[PDB]
Design an enzyme around this catalytic site. Structure first.
Site, mmCIF file in Angstrom:
data_model
loop_
_atom_site.group_PDB
_atom_site.id
_atom_site.type_symbol
_atom_site.label_atom_id
_atom_site.label_comp_id
_atom_site.label_asym_id
_atom_site.label_seq_id
_atom_site.Cartn_x
_atom_site.Cartn_y
_atom_site.Cartn_z
ATOM 1 N N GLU A 103 10.179 35.130 4.129
ATOM 2 C CA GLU A 103 9.816 35.791 3.242
ATOM 3 C C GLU A 103 11.036 36.395 2.407
ATOM 4 O OE1 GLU A 103 6.742 38.846 3.786
ATOM 5 O OE2 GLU A 103 6.493 38.648 6.012
ATOM 6 N N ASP B 38 8.544 46.823 0.484
ATOM 7 C CA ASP B 38 8.715 45.718 -0.477
ATOM 8 C C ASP B 38 9.290 46.126 -1.740
ATOM 9 O OD1 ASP B 38 8.103 44.066 1.743
ATOM 10 O OD2 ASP B 38 6.434 43.078 0.695
#
Length: 406
Positions: A260, A39
């Site tokens: 997301e 991420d």
């Protein structure tokens, strides 16, 4: 009248030669073998360009010790930063925050080096600091007031940092935890974005939109549990810490639960909204793979329509379907580069819940925890095409020329 990624779209989702990435093989060396990273986001200037401080780029990653099992890394995620002079050889810079962080742990966000020189690091506060048992409360926070210094040996991000929550779901436009049916709600991934047209300042995030009981908003009650949406907040003064919620940009009601890490790339007057999504978060009756999905409109808050008809922009091959995830798109002169991370590989035939049964090392051996080969795509309207790849975790400036393509 919020734009909708409809079921008629998702029914057309399908892997094609134009949307599947090549196989990712593990890299030759790691910037830190002792840590796993995923991420990741870039330190950007206010306009959106990759920030450069004394010739250095800065990036941020969620990190957990490599000793830890993959399945649980999200419970102890900490933000670390890396810097580089070229875009390939990254140096570990350590944790960005010396405590005072909001939340039991931190999830992905974004980073802004403002014109005044103040550093703002937006992140997600998962839980509350020093909880008894791990909760899943998500709030948009920021670590304001950082100072980035750069000599000729490296980069230091120094304090003092001031942390506070910026946004929590209102419960009318963005669903609260109490309101969550089906799976756990989402309110995370704050991405700063200054609109290059209006000049106005926005902050995008992933949220869910509440659907009342028995609302009849969908043709099946269970489908109403999948209510993912890309929310947006506005800052009237432009202050990166003063925000007011707006109506969501896009909703995937009855299609997906988790949209997301949303972000926008503006290209020649068109706004491309990208979101990463899982396969297990699709509503029943729909089959879509773990991938980067995208939409395009003529204004930031306009009528988004899905890229390639279905929405699928980029995905992993069938015989390695979890190798990469959490992609970010950014312009480089007439190409679009997409950087993910190297996720789950060498599964053979196993599903993700099957991997939890395996011994600790057989699990750790099937998790990359590094940067994926940067993918080069070409936008052509509402249609995309994969054109190539670059070295592992290559984040180039527009000042740099990339190798030629076949």
């Amino acid at each position: 009248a919020t734009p909708r990624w409809t079921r008629e779209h998702a029914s057309k989702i399908e892997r094609t030669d134009e949307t599947v990435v090549p196989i990712i093989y593990p890299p030759r060396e790691d910037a830190a073998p002792e840590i796993n990273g995923w991420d990741t986001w870039f330190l950007r200037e206010r306009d959106g360009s990759i920030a450069t401080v004394g010739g250095w780029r800065v990036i941020f990653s969620l990190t957990a010790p490599a000793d830890l099992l993959p399945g649980k890394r999200h419970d102890v995620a900490e933000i670390r930063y890396f810097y580089s002079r070229d875009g390939e050889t990254w140096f570990d810079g350590g944790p960005v925050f010396e405590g005072g962080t909001r939340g039991s742990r931190q999830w992905a966000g974004s980073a802004l080096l403002d014109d005044d020189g103040r550093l703002y690091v937006f992140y997600t506060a998962s839980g509350r600091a020093g909880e008894a048992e791990i909760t899943y409360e998500q709030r948009l926070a920021v670590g304001s007031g950082g100072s980035v210094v750069a000599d000729d040996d490296g980069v230091r991000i120094e304090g003092p940092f001031a942390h506070g929550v910026l946004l929590e779901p209102d419960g009318e436009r963005y669903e609260r935890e109490e309101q969550s049916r089906g799976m756990i709600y989402t309110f995370r991934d704050p991405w700063f974005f200054e609109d290059p047209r209006s000049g106005k300042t926005y902050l995008l995030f992933e949220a869910n939109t509440p659907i009342p009981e028995g609302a009849g908003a969908c043709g099946d009650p269970v489908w109403e549990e999948f209510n993912g949406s890309v929310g947006i907040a506005h800052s009237p003064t432009g202050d990166p810490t003063d925000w007011e919620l707006c109506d969501p940009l896009l909703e995937g009601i009855c299609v997906n639960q988790e949209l997301e890490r949303p972000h926008v790339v503006v290209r020649n007057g068109f706004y491309y909204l990208f979101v990463s999504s899982h396969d297990h978060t699709f509503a029943p009756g729909l089959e879509g793979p773990d991938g980067l999905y995208g939409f395009v409109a003529d204004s930031l808050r306009g009528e988004y329509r899905p890229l390639n008809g279905s929405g699928l922009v980029l995905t992993n091959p069938a015989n390695a379907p979890y190798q990469a995830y959490s992609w970010v798109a950014f312009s480089h002169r007439e190409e679009l580069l997409v950087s993910g991370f190297f996720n789950y590989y060498d599964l053979g035939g196993l599903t993700l819940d099957d991997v939890a049964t395996l011994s600790p090392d057989e699990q750790r051996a099937k998790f990359g925890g590094t940067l994926a080969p940067t993918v080069r795509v070409a936008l052509s309207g509402d249609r995309t095409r994969i054109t190539g790849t670059l070295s592992h975790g290559r984040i180039p400036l527009e000042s740099e020329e990339l190798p030629d393509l076949p």
